[PDB]
Structures are given as structure tokens and as C-alpha cells.
Design a protein around this ligand. Sequence first.
Ligand SMILES: CC(C)[C@@H](NC(=O)[C@H](CS)NC(=O)CCC[C@H](N)C(=O)O)C(=O)O
Ligand SMILES: [Fe+3]
Length: 329
Amino acid sequence: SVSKANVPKIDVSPLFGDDQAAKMRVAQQIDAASRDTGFFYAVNHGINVQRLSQKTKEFHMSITPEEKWDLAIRAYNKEHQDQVRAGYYLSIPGKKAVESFCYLNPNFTPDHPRIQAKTPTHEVNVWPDETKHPGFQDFAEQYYWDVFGLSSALLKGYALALGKEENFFARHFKPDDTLASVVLIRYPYLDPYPEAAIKTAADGTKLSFEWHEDVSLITVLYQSNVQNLQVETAAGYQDIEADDTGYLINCGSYMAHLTNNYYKAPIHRVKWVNAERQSLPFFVNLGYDSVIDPFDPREPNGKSDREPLSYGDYLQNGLVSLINKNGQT
Ligand SMILES: CC(C)[C@@H](NC(=O)[C@H](CS)NC(=O)CCC[C@H](N)C(=O)O)C(=O)O
Ligand SMILES: [Fe+3]
């Protein structure tokens, strides 16, 4: 018997306005969800997720093996030594079902100083041919700033929930240097489904992706309406209900670090379900030199003995660790 997680639906629209009391009431709900299971659904977010799902589908279903090779990250293409984060992540027929496309800050150009200095985790996005995928790059770049704006509002709610001024996190979340990423993940229907892409958990559950903590400040996830996520609690894993109109929100391990585990990074995993579906996370990352002094909301003085962690060092070590533990995606 698997129980269902209590994932509240929070109306985040006051975070875009100037009703300070209404923002505090949103902040309380974010606090409550972050201290409970760690997940909530953001509703009334203003983002056209229907156009998002349709444009992502057309891209996933029309891209050819030739274009996948030309866009592949260096894990699949030795010629692309500079693409570690951005590019296409190929499925392996008969072996690996999941495939995805990842892109970073569109402001990362050859003219960008972080690219000029060859700073790790900074890459220039690669895109498919415009004539083969008309308007895809325009949609994708626009979506990046749409979810950026939504994430900036959410960070105001998280700051207020912790008793800080509303720009506590958002001041480090800037369009010119953010390391945030969009990942357009396809989970295909396959008949027969390759058993090499199905992992069996310790409790017998069939998984597509094992347990993990998110490498992020927060994660802003859209998924199609197929139930798949489970969150770990002390009483075991609980199913997270699907909702293809809202964004699912949770903290990453950088939030757990700076709050002295007051807001934990929930451990979650992906159940195996043989169904064509989408998973579209936006990983809210700060700048390479972003540092937030850790604090403890439990203590009256808020003092913490945790070392400040440069976000760039956190992100580089976290992305490598996630590959070593859960595998190349
Ligand atoms: C759980 C979902 C968010 C999704 N999993 C994921 O997106 C998993 C676990 S959070 N994330 C990753 O592998 C890290 C991708 C980071 C990205 N390439 C970058 O350079 O920033 C899924 O459906 O598998
Ligand atoms: Fe995750």
C-alpha cells in the first residue's frame, strides 16, 4: 500500500502584486509545504503551459538522428568537448528510453565575459536548424524568461517565509549571469519497453530514475498529466499527484545548505510508467560567484556554523555527483 503525498496548491499570483499582507499569506503556505513534504503546486502562475507542451512535443517528435548527433553533448559526441550541459541527450534504442534537450541562459554568447574567461558550467546554447524547426528557438528563449519571471516571484515568497526581505534570494538571481537551465525531457511509450531502462528500487518499485536531491536553489517543474513522482518521507515513499496546469515546486540542496536543513531538499524518485509524457524542469541556479551566508531560522539570533558555499563550486560538484550516482541521462 502506497499512500499519497499532501501537495497543496498555492495561488502565487499575489507575489506579482503589491499587497504585502497577501504576499505574507502566500509565504506562510510556502513555509508550511517546505516543512511538510517539500512539494507544492504553484497555480495562477500566468504561463501558457499549453503552448509549452505543444511546442515541446513538435520538437521531440520531429527531430531526426542526424540533428541529434549535431546537437549531442560530449557524453554522446566526442567532437563536442565544449558541450557538457547544453545540447541533446540521446536515448539508446533497446537500452535507454529517456532523451532530453538542455539549454542555458540565452545571454551566454561568445561576447559574454564568462564565456571569454572559459568559466566552468558556462556554455553557449546550441540550437537545431531554424528552417527544420521554425520558431522553436524563439519559443524556447522566450519561455526561459517567462519561467525566470515566475521563479523570481517564487523566491520572494521563500525569502518572506524565512523572515527575510523579499529580495534576499532574488538579488542573486539575475538575467545576465544566472546558471539556471531548462531541460525538455521526453519519456516515451515503448512496446516492448527495454528492461535495461527500468531499475528496481530496494522496496521493489520499478523506477525510471532513482532517488536524488535536486542540484538547485529551487526547482520549477512542469509535467504532463501522468503520475510518476514519489517523495520520500519517514514512513516511506508517497505518490505525488500529477497536475498538468500547475508548476510543481521544491527546494534543492543549496536551499538546505543555507537554511541549516530547515528547508530540507526532499528526496524524490521517478516511477516507471509506460506512457508518452513530458518532464520540463527549470533549475533555479544563481550566478557563478553568488554567495549567500548560511543561517539557521530555528535560532533566535539565526547564527549558523556552516561555511558559505559559492554557487559555482556547488553547481559544478553537484552536477558531476548526480551523474556518478544516478547515471548519465
Ligand atoms: C525529476 C525530473 C525533474 C527529471 N529529472 C531531472 O531533471 C534530473 C533529476 S532532478 N536532473 C538532472 O539530471 C540534472 C540536469 C542538469 C542540466 N543538464 C544542467 O546542466 O543544468 C525527470 O523527469 O527525470
Ligand atoms: Fe529531481
